[PDB]
Symmetry: C2
Subunit: 98 residues, 2 copies
């Protein structure tokens, strides 16, 4: 059986481990981060990724590193990219032997 990647959107972790944990609505989070409510709404709906600026805001608000959020984002972006082009990439790139 071959390896695979299944995507987990960062907004799912935001919803489950932060918004639901502290009983914060997405709109209340947007007001606290000083961003537009659709900005947070898009993320929790899994319709937008975490930008660097947003990662710094979330880290500041929730006492995390900004990299925590960017690492969740990179995993999601890698999973979607892998499911789309990963098999072809592995088919056409011969690993370096040196």
């Amino acid at each position: 059986a071959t390896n695979g990647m299944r995507p987990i959107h960062p907004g799912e972790i935001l919803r489950d481990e932060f918004l639901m944990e502290f009983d914060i609505s997405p709109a209340a989070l947007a007001r606290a981060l000083k961003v537009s409510a659709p900005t947070v709404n898009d993320i929790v709906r899994e319709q937008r990724g975490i930008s660097a600026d947003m990662a710094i805001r979330l880290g500041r608000y929730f006492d995390t590193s900004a990299q925590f959020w960017m690492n969740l984002q990179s995993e999601y972006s890698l999973a979607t990219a892998y499911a789309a082009n990963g098999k072809q990439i592995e088919h056409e790139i011969e690993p370096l032997l040196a």
Copy 2:
């Protein structure tokens, strides 16, 4: 925080291209991407995409996250240098409230 940016292209040049004596155009041909795609990264003009991270990991036998983690550190560092103090100023931490 974190303010001093290290572009992923610097690591690519120093730890891989120069370590294995591989030119950027040679790398692009091995990765099956256009040469300006690799050039722009090596010259620190463009970042590493998810697709490129998978290609670089495949070729150099690293994880793809190795490259994406360097990219996010750079993106964070530039974002913080531009706006970090403004962000800290305008957001009150939840647990300070």
